[PDB]
Amino acid sequence: GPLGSPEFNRPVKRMIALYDYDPQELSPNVDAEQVELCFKTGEIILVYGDMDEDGFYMGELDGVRGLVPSNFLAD
């Protein structure tokens, strides 16, 4: 809860992609091509902070940064 000392918390996590994702083929979002990251099964995404209220993580992959759908990654 809110009371007590801060706990250890990793601001960066590595997450394995379990499914291919090309926003142009699969995203329902009007701004997908601008803001979402493309990736392939087996690639690992570095994820920064928490998922947003829509379910996306801010991720990095091979020099490119963008939002990634949490439901395509291994939790």
Partner: peptide
Amino acid sequence: IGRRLPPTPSKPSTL
């Protein structure tokens, strides 16, 4: 217009 997740894949991962 809000953002939402794509539909979740239903087939087992090929990984």
